[PDB]
Scaffold this active site. Structure first.
Site, mmCIF file in Angstrom:
data_model
loop_
_atom_site.group_PDB
_atom_site.id
_atom_site.type_symbol
_atom_site.label_atom_id
_atom_site.label_comp_id
_atom_site.label_asym_id
_atom_site.label_seq_id
_atom_site.Cartn_x
_atom_site.Cartn_y
_atom_site.Cartn_z
ATOM 1 N N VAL A 283 0.859 -1.176 0.000
ATOM 2 C CA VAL A 283 0.000 0.000 0.000
ATOM 3 C C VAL A 283 0.896 1.226 0.000
ATOM 4 O O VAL A 283 1.684 1.433 0.936
ATOM 5 C CB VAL A 283 -0.941 0.006 1.217
ATOM 6 C CG1 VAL A 283 -1.830 1.240 1.197
ATOM 7 C CG2 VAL A 283 -1.778 -1.270 1.239
ATOM 8 N N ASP B 108 -6.560 -29.792 -11.377
ATOM 9 C CA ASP B 108 -5.192 -29.793 -11.904
ATOM 10 C C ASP B 108 -4.593 -31.173 -11.646
ATOM 11 O O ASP B 108 -4.369 -31.547 -10.487
ATOM 12 C CB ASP B 108 -4.351 -28.699 -11.233
ATOM 13 C CG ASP B 108 -3.135 -28.297 -12.053
ATOM 14 O OD1 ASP B 108 -2.912 -28.872 -13.142
ATOM 15 O OD2 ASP B 108 -2.385 -27.403 -11.599
ATOM 16 N N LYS C 151 -6.813 6.913 -2.182
ATOM 17 C CA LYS C 151 -8.109 6.360 -2.571
ATOM 18 C C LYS C 151 -8.883 5.876 -1.356
ATOM 19 O O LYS C 151 -10.103 6.052 -1.278
ATOM 20 C CB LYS C 151 -7.916 5.229 -3.576
ATOM 21 C CG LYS C 151 -7.478 5.757 -4.935
ATOM 22 C CD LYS C 151 -7.069 4.633 -5.860
ATOM 23 C CE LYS C 151 -7.112 5.107 -7.301
ATOM 24 N NZ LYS C 151 -6.028 6.067 -7.550
#
Ligand code: NA
EC number: 2.7.7.7
Length: 320
Positions: free
Chosen positions: A56, A183, A63
């Site tokens: 961050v 997978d 924001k």
DNA sequence: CCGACGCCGCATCAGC
DNA sequence: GCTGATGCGG
DNA sequence: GTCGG
């Protein structure tokens, strides 16, 4: 979650960076910020508080300040309402339509699934399959169904040749209650790095009507679609990948594709400190000047743990 | 200040 | 026709 | 967009 407004905001921003702006490193920056915030065990009160977390920075802090003060983000409100950007972003939910394809479609007026349906000739094979199963591919797979899928895969593999080894990896192997896809890692003693095999297994799963479509298929990697047999309502179609790996690289591969991603980076970091380099394929010793030696013999996952002097960690304990 | 940020198999395009 | 680049998924 | 050499 405690900061879901923020993490949803950051994820939506990430998606527009990837799909509209074609800025993959900003996509990953927003995702990393969303992840570190998601693990923060306090409700964030300010951007400054969030900026203390790794990933961050100044802009995301700004924001968050706007979101906490006003309950929205002007830039996100705007791009949401933007017909062209919202349509590009949406079309990338089709498997096979990436940012480039989505832009080209929207440029020629093709903006919705219905437009795609009307324009099949403009879609390649993968994209047609992605459109065909659009809703099914977005559903998750409950563990009970993954177990039924694993039953089929392991049975049919052994039927083709009992010397195959097959391992269903991913979060399923770590014990997850649901999965996004299946997978499968496959090997055979005849296939080594030094020394057909995939085709025979794909063909058998097609013959028993488990595999229903193929997205791509080569000598070592299959990507396609499967579906459990219906008793009742039918089961959703599911994404399945099958990878053929040399025997001497198999357990490095099982380790890697079991994860988690976080556990993988922690194990690789620790291996470095012990003088080893681990990747998807091999573990190699590093000399005093950093030169990598030849791959070391690996005959199980635990061999890898033993080389770097780690106690064996069960897949269920590989969350970090 | 400015480059890293994962990498590779397969499908398909751009170019020769 | 082949070779290499790009897009895509994960 | 964030980090760090
Ligand atoms: Na920044």
């Amino acid at each position: 979650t405690l900061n879901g407004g923020i993490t949803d905001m950051l994820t939506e921003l990430a998606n527009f960076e990837k799909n509209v702006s074609q800025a993959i490193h900003k996509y990953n920056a927003y995702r990393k910020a969303a992840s570190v915030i998601a693990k923060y065990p306090h409700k964030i009160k300010s951007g400054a508080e969030a900026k203390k977390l790794p990933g961050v920075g100044t802009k995301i802090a700004e924001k968050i300040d706007e979101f906490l003060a006003t309950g929205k983000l002007r830039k996100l409100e705007k791009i949401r309402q933007d017909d062209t950007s919202s349509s590009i972003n949406f079309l990338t939910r089709v498997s096979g339509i990436g940012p480039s394809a989505a832009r080209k479609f929207v440029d020629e007026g093709i903006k919705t699934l219905e437009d795609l349906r009307k324009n099949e000739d403009k879609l390649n094979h993968h994209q047609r399959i992605g459109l065909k199963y659009f809703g099914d591919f977005e559903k998750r797979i409950p563990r009970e169904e993954m177990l039924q899928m694993q039953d089929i895969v392991l049975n049919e593999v052994k039927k083709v040749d009992s010397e195959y080894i097959a391992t269903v990896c991913g979060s399923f192997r770590r014990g997850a209650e649901s999965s996004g896809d299946m997978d499968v890692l496959l090997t055979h003693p005849s296939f080594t790095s030094e020394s057909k095999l995939l085709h025979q297994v794909v063909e058998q799963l097609q013959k028993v009507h488990f595999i229903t479509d193929t997205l791509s298929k080569g000598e070592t990697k299959f990507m396609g679609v499967c579906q459990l047999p219906s008793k009742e309502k039918e089961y959703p179609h599911r994404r399945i990948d099958i990878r053929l790996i040399p025997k001497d690289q198999y357990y490095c591969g099982v380790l890697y594709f079991t994860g988690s991603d976080i556990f993988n980076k922690n194990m690789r970091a620790h291996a470095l400190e012990k003088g080893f380099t681990i990747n998807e394929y091999t573990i190699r010793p590093l000399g005093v000047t950093g030169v990598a030696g030849e791959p070391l013999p690996v005959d199980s996952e635990k061999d890898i743990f033993d080389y770097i002097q780690w106690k064996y960690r069960e897949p269920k304990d590989r969350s970090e």
